[PDB]
Amino acid sequence: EFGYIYRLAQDYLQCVLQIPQGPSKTSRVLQNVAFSVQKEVEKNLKSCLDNVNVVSVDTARTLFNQVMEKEFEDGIINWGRIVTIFAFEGILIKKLLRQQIAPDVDTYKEISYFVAEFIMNNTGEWIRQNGGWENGFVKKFEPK
């Protein structure tokens, strides 16, 4: 359901922004894995990320749509690709915090909405068939 995925996307942005939320076991596991992916993307794509300014929520939405088109270009879905969506929204929110021309403290609420909309509509059916978040994602990524 949308509400569950919106809460995961909002919880991850609050984790990256260092603001209080507590989160479910699914959200706790996702925060750990997505942050590890995010730090690896930030190191490997440093020069690339520094060349593009994200000064509005509309710019962030357009960049997000272009990134998703390339991430899923071959029509394949897997859990690693889904974790990368959350790592990506963490990078977008860090750029918007620094660069948003009209700062708005509620912007993270709009980014997590369009991330939840993408996940539900484009990957939701695959997620349910693969166990959902509690029997699919958590089972694969929770500590050994």
Ligand SMILES: *CCC(=O)N(c1ccc(O[C@@H]2CC[C@@H](NC(=O)N[C@H]3CCNC3)C2)cc1)[C@@H](C)c1ccc(Cl)cc1
């Ligand atoms: C230099 C590229 C560019 O100009 N981008 C851009 C920035 C980031 C970006 O990140 C995606 C998400 C992480 C990485 N994908 C993967 O690691 N995928 C794995 C997962 C399993 N299969 C492979 C790439 C892509 C492109 C622009 C559009 C951009 C700049 C700055 C910001 Cl804040 C956003 C976008």
